[PDB]
């Protein structure tokens, strides 16, 4: 019930 | 260090210090980086900090805290699971390690890729995009200030 | 070999503080030890990464478990020993301390102009190592004057769950001090020391 009800945005942050 | 926004745009920032990578109305992602070397606007991550913002029925408030030669695989007060032994909306796991906040259609990755931290974060568009006008800086949705590129 | 305790019980009595319960099945109704048996105790946490387990030896049904961390969750199992004879450890009990008033102050704060708003400057920091209990808030300070009195400080009060905060109005090529303390249901933790920023000027085109 708590679980969300349909597109996923990505982020990242990563060396160098 | 290198940030790939929710917008797809990479970017390069120094971004010295505690930046707000993700500051919305269920999550707040904070990242201390610091210079590579003394002077260098080259900068890398060794403090990660993910609030979990209380959700009434769901889950309680939970912390997440990474350091560099620190990846514990439980929240700030020992446990691994949000609100009651039943309740199963918010999770850690060891492999990377996971949280899966399935109450919110959010999972956040974090690893130590040599001395410092990495990042993945994937998230609703609706809930990525959800939160309030004085929130406007956050590097996952805008990107870096032009001044720190 | 030898039964493993049963019912191992966690007694919660303060932030720092958990008393241990078991019952021996090996043992008379209630619950006489009249040989020279031993328990052991063993805890640990999640917190931080790869922790051992601690262990005590106890000579009655009981053990109280002291110097643990306050609002922290921790697991805690029992042996019985006698000279040769050894038994396995018990099923697992949980038990979280009470919470404890933030022992340490916000960490990395950091001070930055807003983008295209140089009279108004973001502050951005990291929670105490030592919260000791869920943030319900925090209180910004700051001040042009870095020797005014705490009480001469301008006072912005702030959410616990959130890690960036912005003020505006601010006077250009100025220098302020900031400083940010921590809060939660016990009180007010200790206030970070005083953070430099001065605020940027005009370049005029
Ligand atoms: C418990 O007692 C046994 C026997 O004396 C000993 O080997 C063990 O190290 C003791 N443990 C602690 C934590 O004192």
């Known amino acids: 019930p708590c679980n969300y009800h349909p597109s996923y945005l990505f982020c990242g942050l990563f060396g160098d | 260090p290198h940030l790939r926004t929710f917008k797809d745009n990479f970017q390069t920032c120094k971004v010295e210090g505690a930046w707000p990578l993700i500051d919305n109305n269920y999550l707040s992602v904070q990242v201390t980086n610091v210079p590579v070397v003394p002077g260098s606007s080259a900068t890398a991550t060794n403090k990660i900090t993910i609030i979990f913002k209380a959700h009434h029925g769901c889950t309680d408030q939970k912390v997440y805290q990474a350091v560099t030669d620190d990846l514990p695989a439980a929240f700030v007060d020992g446990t691994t699971s949000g609100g009651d032994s039943d309740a199963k909306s918010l999770r850690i796991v060891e492999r990377y390690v996971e949280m899966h906040a399935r109450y919110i259609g959010t999972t956040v990755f974090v690893r130590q890729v040599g001395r410092y931290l990495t990042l993945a974060i994937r998230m609703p568009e609706d809930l990525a995009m959800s939160y309030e006008?004085?929130?406007?800086?956050?590097?996952?949705?805008?990107?870096?200030?032009?001044?720190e590129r | 070999p030898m039964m493993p305790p049963v019912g191992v019980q966690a007694s919660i009595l303060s932030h720092d503080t958990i008393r241990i319960t078991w019952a021996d099945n090996s043992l008379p109704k209630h619950q006489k030890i009249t040989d020279s048996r031993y328990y052991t105790v063993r805890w640990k946490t999640n917190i931080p990464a790869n922790t051992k387990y601690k262990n005590a030896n106890?000579?009655?049904?009981?053990?109280?478990?002291?110097?643990?961390?306050?609002?922290?969750?921790?697991?805690?199992?029992?042996?019985?020993t006698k000279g040769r004879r050894s038994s396995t450890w018990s099923m697992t009990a949980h038990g979280a301390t009470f919470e404890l008033v933030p022992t340490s102050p916000p960490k990395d704060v950091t001070v930055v102009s807003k983008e295209g708003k140089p009279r108004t400057i973001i502050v951005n920091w990291q929670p105490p190592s030592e919260a000791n209990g869920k943030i319900t808030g925090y209180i910004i300070y700051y001040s042009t004057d870095v020797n005014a009195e705490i009480h001469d400080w301008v006072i912005e009060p702030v959410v616990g769950n959130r890690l960036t905060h912005q003020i505006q109005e601010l006077t250009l090529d100025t220098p302020y001090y900031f400083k940010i303390q921590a809060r939660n249901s016990k009180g007010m933790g200790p206030m970070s020391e005083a953070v430099q920023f001065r605020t940027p000027k005009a370049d005029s085109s």
């Open chain 3, 58 to 80: 106890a000579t009655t049904l009981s053990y109280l478990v002291t110097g643990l961390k306050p609002n922290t969750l921790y697991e805690f199992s029992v042996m019985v």
């Open chain 2, 133 to 147: 006008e004085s929130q406007d800086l956050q590097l996952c949705v805008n990107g870096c200030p032009l001044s």
